[PDB]
């Protein structure tokens, strides 16, 4: 089976048109990406303290 990755058409009701116009004029998805990067900023880093800490190894 298969699926289409980009085959949807936007709804043309006045509410949807206004929402898209607000997204265009007020940079909503850009602020969303900013929020994602800020979330990563407040997460904990994954860096080990080499050479005092070593990565995992196996036999």
């Amino acid at each position: 089976t298969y699926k289409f990755v980009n085959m949807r058409e936007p709804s043309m009701d006045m509410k949807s048109v206004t929402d898209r116009a607000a997204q265009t004029l007020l940079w909503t998805e850009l602020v969303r990406g900013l929020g994602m990067t800020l979330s990563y900023l407040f997460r904990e880093p994954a860096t080990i303290n080499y050479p005092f800490e070593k990565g995992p190894l196996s036999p």
């Binding site: 509410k15 206004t18 929402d19 898209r20 116009a21 607000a22 997204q23 007020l26 909503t28 969303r32």
Partner: protein, 71 residues
Amino acid sequence: ASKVKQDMPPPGGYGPIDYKRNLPRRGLSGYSMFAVGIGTLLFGYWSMMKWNRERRRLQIEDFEARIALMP
């Protein structure tokens, strides 16, 4: 009395693994966003109107003091 031991999944298998996209909506409406913008614009305009009228009166007072001193 030793049995074959091997890397196998647990009885009943593993739990479901999520793979679908999960981008939510997480937003207000365009109408509400525009309303907030217009409201803050109007509040700012009103405040600047009052403050700038006060500044004009202050300038008139300073100019009058200068006129009094000019002779």
